[PDB]
RNA sequence: GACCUGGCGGUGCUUCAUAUCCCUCUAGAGGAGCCUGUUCUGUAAUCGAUAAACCCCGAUCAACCUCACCACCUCUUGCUCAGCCUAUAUACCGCCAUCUUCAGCAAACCCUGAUGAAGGCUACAAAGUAAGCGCAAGUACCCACGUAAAGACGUUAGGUCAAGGUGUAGCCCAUGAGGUGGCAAGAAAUGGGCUACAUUUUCUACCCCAGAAAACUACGAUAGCCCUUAUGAAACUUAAGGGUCGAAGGUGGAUUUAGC
RNA sequence: UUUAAGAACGUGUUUAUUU
């Protein structure tokens, strides 16, 4: 599609927690679990509203099972009219 | 809402669309206790009075 | 068709606490301040204490939604340690595995 | 993407055990899946409370229970309107009397909405999940009762009543009701005039010359009341004229030319009613040929939109014309028009789809080269339609014409995969072709490996009602294909089945049995050939026996042979 | 001794499947997960509701396809969709499978307010990994 | 609730108590043993108490060339199906209770003199259909082990013969 | 059991499936090696299972199915080998050949190489072997070498020897770089516990060290920490000859010094002789210290300590 | 007799076919459709991995058969008609901040489930350097005292983060409004300012 | 009477134990105060664990709720096509403890013992071949190390019917359901832990080049008492902080825990 | 050849095509 893209791998996060092994007593004996969350950031640059609307829809639909996404959009704006000159 | 889950699957079993292996189990036991005489008594007219 | 009566009593408590949540909120605001007169704050102390007991949120208990167990419950899944492990040990909880390090 | 030739329609489960093999399964598999959707909707609308909880965001209205019961239990003008939107014929009419009996003023826009509900369904309840011949309209019905109760009647009152009569084959009564309309200084609409054209012809079975004059009167009245015709108005004319195949031919074109005059684009249904009319069971078909060629040039390179309910029936008919004309260059235009844009959606239901691809493919095998006929057989089947026993036959008669009999062992495999494993006519034409002439060893050994599979089908048959029967030609061909191949051992075991089922063996099967015995030099086997034919009293046997006696025969056996006759 | 999700050894006449033959300490080494969603990821939400839906689905399908399931289900979530993938036997007639596919896909769509699709893979007999 | 319901294999495994501490060292009387019963044996898919007829599942899809519609059996006709299901149940059950009169040997509960049939056929096309096997002694012998303790083992003595001078015994 | 006909049908499915997989990915079926198959199977069927023997695999049937011995007797029933009834015709036919070559010698008269291991000898013979059987065969081979073996014998003995890749415990020198001014220096990295340090050692200097932009004696008040910084340079007699500029992050007081000590030593290896670098290695100045904090266990007070035990 | 299953359609497939037509969209692994002798599973002693037929491990995988390179290149060729060209003028980032001095950040979250809502989507961040604004000595000195820790002197950037209102369009308006009242009050001079 | 197998021996010889048996190292427990559990006693007033393998154990947790206890009162087809935390863990599933800081269990065959219970090895080899499970191998964490995890068959009718389910037995105007209020204390003994008895210390600054303190105003309570705040509808009661107070205690008996 | 070193309630643990 003619888009600039850079890829880097942020550090993973591992959340652990422990639970009792038995239904009754036997405190000393426990079981530990973990959920591993792995990341992958795709930094695009110099897009337009329409190009991003297409690329995002294309990859969001083909987002596999067990994979979430956080899309941060950095828009370019111009100074409002009221900001150009002071009224006082 | 356990009412919905339990009422839905109770209706689906009477309709013939869901087979509850657990009710069938306790329905067979409750049928063998009638032949053995261990039947639930009538309310109010119980052993005590 | 809930697990037990202990569960059923908590369902009612969570329902009555959802109806009076706003009424209790508005009255407590009067009590939690040093601005309004003491005479007015004393009347709000009696109005919120005359509301039904089950409307108080501290009387709610986070039980397991499958077994009605009051203790040993994980808040993220709303399950007891015994039911959570039964599903995790059979590979039915996405991403959950045993830890080794 | 494009259609996957190796697959069946998406709607089916992509699994070998669940894939529809035959065309009956294809239709019975979707009717069972549609029956489960109805069993679930029945349960969803009978116990709404279980499915009321909505957790979706954004809200999905199409996934919530429907409420078919009236909620306003009071008797008022707004309580009847709610029973007309739910199409409650019995409740609305029984409640309309109560509202009328009370004396409350009923608006004319509300009483007109009740007639539409009654004039359409004919004072009968719509079809629900769970609770042809003759004239549906009845004299003892509420439609006519309420019509008299009304104190005031506008144009719409009669317009909706005339259309309800024609719909239920009350043509004779509709015309009588139209006379009253003209007596009240009123004017009908386009739709009412459209139904009036159907009643004219259907009322009486008169000659065309009289009907044509009758129809022209309604048209002159349509222009005399400032009423403009629509596409449907012209379609009814053509649909009605179908009965008079020969005479209506020229009048039909005049109707078509008229449609073009008023700038009304003929839809697919318009052209459908024309080809059916011109088409007639005749041998020459000179006129039919010229018509279709002109229509295609007009339709070529166009995209169609739904205008008439019968637009779908165009393609099925056009193909039938090409098949009757045996013109393949025209079928490529009819089918090439079905692929442009989204015109593939007009092909119609399954039964119409199977018929289209049968006449089409049956005309391909007959006319075009075999190398191209096999590319159409890989694309259409099974992705498009499931073939019928006849199509397999016509395809077999094309391989013969092209001397490509090496594919026969493959056409039999596909036949079993399409449900033709136990088709008598099919198995009786595959064997004859393989055994018609001698072929090289490599090709002669393949036909036997296929003749052994055709033989097993005769042994195991699904229908056990009647005793297993082996056609005479079959047994004649299964045995001769073992000899030529080299399976002599199995060739002698079929001999008992000939007399067992009283099936006559051909002389060519007996004449070739000689070499098999001669190569073996086992006089015993040679006598068995003689013994069999003697039972049937075949003349060739007696003359044959002498030659066998000259070539190879034991002295003791020679004497016994003559006495057995 | 440990007991969770372990099939005890026997004389050698007991057949087991791949998933049924591996214990919990293989769930990310030699097995995968039978359900795949985003609830249990860092910063995600609604992991408790996704679990109750899973528990109900495995029971709805066990009693709706009685004696037909060859192995455990595989639930998949891609956005709004919910894909149920099952391995079933070939005893039942295909006519009855198509009925239950349309009955379950529809009933579950109105219950959970999501498009639901069911994918069957028939096997002649229950696959056997080894004999314990 | 619906979430506190297990499967049949879990319900029977616990009720039978086949694997327990009582079963290991003769701590349980065999006079009243609990017997497993399959409750899905005589159940049809689509049959319920209300008597609904689902086309494609409970009844044929098409009838007289036309697809059927949803129908429900009548009270009188549905009651005849419940009573008929019982007869099939009791009959099936009765067969199991019925005990065959096995030919006793030297005594009713003894094993001696009882026949075991012909030996099993050998792999290399060997058969012993002409031979007859008969038990002579069945003894229960024990040996003490360090972990379990008393380890019960069976000692059997049999004889085989063809009736024509060929005979032999083994343990 | 897997017959020869079965394997022959698996060879045909792999060849056909190898042409499909190349049509999917858009490659040339001809020049499609096994390395490209493994890369395409990991994209189409992504599995993150820690065990690589449990991931999807599409290999050649000759590498998946275990090698099996051919049939040893024909239709008549006579075996093909004269040592068949031993049960180890392959192992004993080898011992018979070797012992026959030791008789001929009597009549007419290692660094990289390692003796074949047991598990690798079973594959060659397609026979199951005991440990004591492996030792007996190895004793004959060694006895064969001692004797004046002929050329043909050496080739035989080399079928049961496997080369060894001898690693080199020689430190890797860093490339000397040049700055804008033209001064030569070398950069390295160290790691101690959670501390991580990057050190820049200039070829010529007046013995100045700056840690995070601060002179070393101010950054490390404790004498012990400064002793560590002195150890690399004192060992090679280069005190007051180089200028160091390092940046350490993380860890604690003493872990940052050890991390810097290691980086300075690694970067100081470019301005010294090879013999000195070896001495630094034998003194423990170039080795990363693997001793890191051990984890606490459940049911215990610490990594190794236990709760107080009560007998009664 | 019993109904028998048809042979898998992988045999009818050709090698030089169009795979995207077979797996156009995301779908589970169908061994009767994928013409690969792929195996999966941990092998037993002297055994081989389990075959694809009946394998549950291959059904657990989120495959990428519908996203082969051939399809991707063919999909994007049809998606170039929806795209727009980026201004050639705005080559670097220094030139982007000269004509567009304001940067709006907003995050969208994609998660499985029936509800798409997320409260983290309402947040809006607005960054702008004070060198791009028409400020004088006094205004700039006063503006830095009102925003407090929202201004970074090291970068000379004013950061405004709004998460008060439910919707994201409202917080965008709120942020612009905040930048406006700050700019004008900064210019305004009051009497108390004299007592500095 | 004579044997088989196992167990046991204050039974022999030999080789060993690696934080483990002795000797040998380091810090603790047992003494004081406090926190906390348990046992007894007490109360109208839960239950369960309770040699090793119970004792900050079910509880990653009790002011009401939780809660199953006591008193009083109230309801009867009852949130449930009812219900019961009623009895039975010596009927069970399920999840575990323990030997295990082990390496053996064993189907199917063969042979020996005159065809007995049983047994089955010697490598310069004498009847053993062995699927499978476990160990091992692999995998996780920072490796090849180490730590985790794993750890069969069985042993203690070991623990749990009060996670849930459940066989058998029992209650059905009550052994069920709901409401209000209330008990959860200490003569006494004991387990574990916290803080101290000080100068390698105490306070302040700093976060390692300092100044003061240092025995009846020292060191030393997280205790008591009083006040305030936080949470909550509700706090002498729970927590935090402040004030006041300045106790025992001067390194601890027989004995005893952990650590490469 | 080499200090002393007691005691442990009673039962219960194995078969059968539109038209
Ligand atoms: K002490
Ligand atoms: K103490
Ligand atoms: K203590
Ligand atoms: Mg609480
Ligand atoms: Mg353990
Ligand atoms: Mg008797
Ligand atoms: Mg410590
Ligand atoms: Mg207690
Ligand atoms: Mg007790
Ligand atoms: Mg107990
Ligand atoms: Mg309480
Ligand atoms: Mg209370
Ligand atoms: Mg009770
Ligand atoms: Mg027990
Ligand atoms: Mg461990
Ligand atoms: Mg291991
Ligand atoms: Mg006990
Ligand atoms: Mg403790
Ligand atoms: Mg104090
Ligand atoms: Mg307060
Ligand atoms: Mg003091
Ligand atoms: Mg005594
Ligand atoms: Mg005793």
From Swiss-Prot, chain C:
Keywords: Disease variant, Mitochondrion, Primary mitochondrial disease, Ribonucleoprotein, Ribosomal protein. GO terms for biological process: mitochondrial translation; translation. Transmembrane segments: none annotated. One of its GO terms (cellular component) is nuclear membrane. It is found in: Mitochondrion. One of its GO terms (molecular function) is structural constituent of ribosome. Component of the mitochondrial small ribosomal subunit (mt-SSU). Mature mammalian 55S mitochondrial ribosomes consist of a small (28S) and a large (39S) subunit. The 28S small subunit contains a 12S ribosomal RNA (12S mt-rRNA) and 30 different proteins. The 39S large subunit contains a 16S rRNA (16S mt-rRNA), a copy of mitochondrial valine transfer RNA (mt-tRNA(Val)), which plays an integral structural role, and 52 different proteins. Interacts with LIAT1. It is linked to Combined oxidative phosphorylation deficiency 38: An autosomal recessive disorder due to mitochondrial dysfunction and characterized by perinatal hypertrophic cardiomyopathy, growth retardation, muscle hypotonia, elevated lactate, dysmorphy and intellectual disability. Belongs to the universal ribosomal protein uS14 family. This is Small ribosomal subunit protein uS14m. The lineage of its organism: Eukaryota, Metazoa, Chordata, Craniata, Vertebrata. The chain holds residues 28 to 128 of 128 of the full protein.
UniProtKB/Swiss-Prot annotation, chain D:
PROSITE patterns: PPR. GO terms for cellular component: cytosol; mitochondrial inner membrane; mitochondrial matrix; mitochondrial small ribosomal subunit; mitochondrion; nucleoplasm; plasma membrane. This is Small ribosomal subunit protein mS39. GO terms for molecular function: ribosomal small subunit binding; RNA binding; rRNA binding. The keyword rRNA-binding applies. GO terms for biological process: mitochondrial translation; regulation of translation. InterPro entries: Pentatricopeptide_rpt, PTCD3, Rib_mS39_PPR, TPR-like_helical_dom_sf. Belongs to the mitochondrion-specific ribosomal protein mS39 family. The modification N6-acetyllysine is found at residue 49. It is linked to Combined oxidative phosphorylation deficiency 51: An autosomal recessive, mitochondrial disorder characterized by intrauterine growth retardation, low birth weight, poor overall growth, progressive limb rigidity, delayed psychomotor development, hearing loss, and optic atrophy. Brain imaging shows abnormal bilateral signs at the basal ganglia and brainstem. Patient cells show decreased mitochondrial complex I and IV levels and activities, and generalized mitochondrial translation defects. PPR repeats lie at residues 72-106, 107-131, 154-188, 189-229, 230-266, 267-308, 311-345, 353-387, 388-422, 471-505. It comes from the Eukaryota. Pfam families: PPR_3, Rib_mS39_PPR. Mitochondrial RNA-binding protein that has a role in mitochondrial translation. Abundant in testes, skeletal muscle and heart tissue. It is found in: Mitochondrion. The keyword RNA-binding applies. Its main location: mitochondrion.
UniProtKB/Swiss-Prot annotation, chain E:
Its main location: mitochondrion. It comes from the Eukaryota. One of its GO terms (biological process) is mitochondrial translation. Keywords: Mitochondrion, Ribonucleoprotein, Ribosomal protein, Transit peptide. The keyword Ribosomal protein applies. One of its GO terms (cellular component) is mitochondrial inner membrane. The keyword Cell inner membrane does not apply. It is found in: Mitochondrion. One of its GO terms (molecular function) is structural constituent of ribosome. Belongs to the universal ribosomal protein uS3 family. Component of the mitochondrial small ribosomal subunit (mt-SSU). Mature mammalian 55S mitochondrial ribosomes consist of a small (28S) and a large (39S) subunit. The 28S small subunit contains a 12S ribosomal RNA (12S mt-rRNA) and 30 different proteins. The 39S large subunit contains a 16S rRNA (16S mt-rRNA), a copy of mitochondrial valine transfer RNA (mt-tRNA(Val)), which plays an integral structural role, and 52 different proteins. This is Small ribosomal subunit protein uS3m. The lineage of its organism: Eukaryota, Metazoa, Chordata, Craniata, Vertebrata. The chain holds residues 36 to 167 of 167 of the full protein.
Curated annotation (Swiss-Prot), chain H:
Keywords: Coiled coil, Mitochondrion, Ribonucleoprotein, Ribosomal protein, Transit peptide. It comes from Homo sapiens. One of its GO terms (cellular component) is cytosol. GO terms for biological process: mitochondrial translation. It is found in: Mitochondrion. The chain holds residues 48 to 243 of 323 of the full protein. Component of the mitochondrial small ribosomal subunit (mt-SSU). Mature mammalian 55S mitochondrial ribosomes consist of a small (28S) and a large (39S) subunit. The 28S small subunit contains a 12S ribosomal RNA (12S mt-rRNA) and 30 different proteins. The 39S large subunit contains a 16S rRNA (16S mt-rRNA), a copy of mitochondrial valine transfer RNA (mt-tRNA(Val)), which plays an integral structural role, and 52 different proteins. This is Small ribosomal subunit protein mS35. One of its GO terms (molecular function) is RNA binding. Belongs to the mitochondrion-specific ribosomal protein mS35 family.
